[PDB]
């Protein structure tokens, strides 16, 4: 709809962006407030640094996308210079927070938890026929009360088909990134499944970077030969073999979010 029309447009005079989180070279990320007393994330648009379509692209699949686990759109300004409001996440980045003091401090209990939290956001969008190609421990935001959601949309997709297919020259992170995506480029939500495998990891570890000591050619070469990530320090077994589920060659061979999901409530409601 227009934005007079757009449930989501919001006059710019109703935002005070309060602190800078980040920035980059397609923007910053502040910490604000919309009317005086709700506290928000603003992601604004360096103008001229990318398209301002692809930009709002972004918040237009999560008008369709909206679920207590995935981070929420609040409102979008759609005149120069752009920004996309959304749902604030206190302890920020999953990454990030596992290694401060509280973090540090977590059972294997309440990561498992944590765990079956973003399996939970997962199965949502896997049911609603999306994916979500960045997934990883630095796009999963965490609440005050310790809740996870699932967040950066930028490249997330409505399949159609049962596959997206990506530009020849697009690239993806070689660790996270299931092997049929790095090879053909091709997407599904199986390709999300592996990449939750290797979250699992991030989150076993504290945010380390998966597979220690090597370079992404040697990922790629022990991948080939039948190899997968060596078992992470302190990693109860039934949760690497979890990892290895979601590790199977063949995309249709990988579990599905809502069996994910499951098994981690389970240990979770078992430890």
Same mark, same amino acid.
């Given at each position: 709809?227009?934005?007079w029309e757009?449930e989501?447009e919001?006059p710019?005079?109703?935002?005070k962006?309060?602190?800078?989180? =980040?920035?980059?070279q397609?923007g910053?990320?502040?910490? #604000?407030y919309?009317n005086?007393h709700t506290?928000?994330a603003?992601?604004?648009?360096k103008?001229?640094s990318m398209?301002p379509?692809a930009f +709002? %692209?972004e &918040?237009?699949?999560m008008?369709?996308?909206q679920?207590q686990?995935?981070?929420?759109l609040?409102a979008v300004? *759609?005149?120069?210079?752009?920004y996309?409001?959304?749902e604030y996440?206190?302890?920020?980045s999953?990454?990030? /927070?596992?290694?401060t003091?509280? =973090?540090?401090?977590?059972?294997?209990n309440?990561?498992?938890?944590m765990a &079956?939290?973003?399996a939970?956001?997962?199965?949502?969008?896997e049911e609603?026929n999306?994916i979500?190609?960045?997934?990883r421990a %630095?796009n999963?935001?965490?609440?005050?009360?310790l809740?996870?959601?699932? &967040?950066?949309? #930028?490249?997330?997709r409505?399949i159609?088909?049962?596959? $997206?297919t %990506?530009?020849?020259?697009?690239?993806?992170?070689?660790?996270?990134?299931?092997?049929e &995506?790095?090879n053909? =480029?091709? /997407?599904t939500?199986?390709?999300?499944?592996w990449?939750? #495998?290797?979250?699992? *990891? @991030?989150?076993?570890?504290?945010?380390?970077?998966?597979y220690?000591?090597?370079?992404n050619?040697?990922?790629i070469?022990n991948?080939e030969? =039948? $190899?997968r990530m060596?078992r992470?320090?302190?990693?109860? @077994?039934? +949760?690497y073999?979890?990892m290895? +589920?979601?590790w199977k060659?063949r995309?249709?061979?990988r579990?599905? /979010?809502?069996?994910?999901r499951?098994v981690l @409530?389970? /240990?979770?409601?078992a430890?």
């Amino acid at each position: 709809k227009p934005w007079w029309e757009d449930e989501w447009e919001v006059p710019r005079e109703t935002l005070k962006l309060v602190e800078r989180l =980040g920035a980059g070279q397609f923007g910053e990320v502040w910490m #604000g407030y919309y009317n005086g007393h709700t506290k928000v994330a603003v992601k604004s648009l360096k103008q001229g640094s990318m398209s301002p379509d692809a930009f +709002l %692209a972004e &918040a237009n699949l999560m008008k369709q996308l909206q679920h207590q686990r995935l981070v929420r759109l609040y409102a979008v300004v *759609t005149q120069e210079p752009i920004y996309i409001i959304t749902e604030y996440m206190e302890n920020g980045s999953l990454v990030d /927070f596992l290694k401060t003091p509280s =973090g540090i401090k977590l059972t294997i209990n309440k990561l498992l938890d944590m765990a &079956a939290q973003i399996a939970e956001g997962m199965a949502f969008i896997e049911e609603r026929n999306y994916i979500h190609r960045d997934l990883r421990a %630095a796009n999963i935001l965490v609440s005050d009360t310790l809740s996870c959601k699932i &967040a950066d949309f #930028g490249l997330a997709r409505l399949i159609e088909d049962n596959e $997206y297919t %990506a530009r020849e020259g697009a690239k993806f992170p070689i660790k996270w990134t299931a092997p049929e &995506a790095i090879n053909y =480029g091709t /997407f599904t939500i199986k390709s999300d499944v592996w990449s939750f #495998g290797i979250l699992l *990891t @991030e989150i076993v570890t504290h945010g380390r970077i998966p597979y220690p000591g090597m370079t992404n050619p040697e990922v790629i070469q022990n991948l080939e030969r =039948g $190899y997968r990530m060596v078992r992470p320090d302190n990693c109860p @077994e039934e +949760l690497y073999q979890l990892m290895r +589920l979601c590790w199977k060659e063949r995309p249709e061979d990988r579990p599905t /979010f809502d069996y994910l999901r499951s098994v981690l @409530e389970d /240990f979770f409601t078992a430890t």
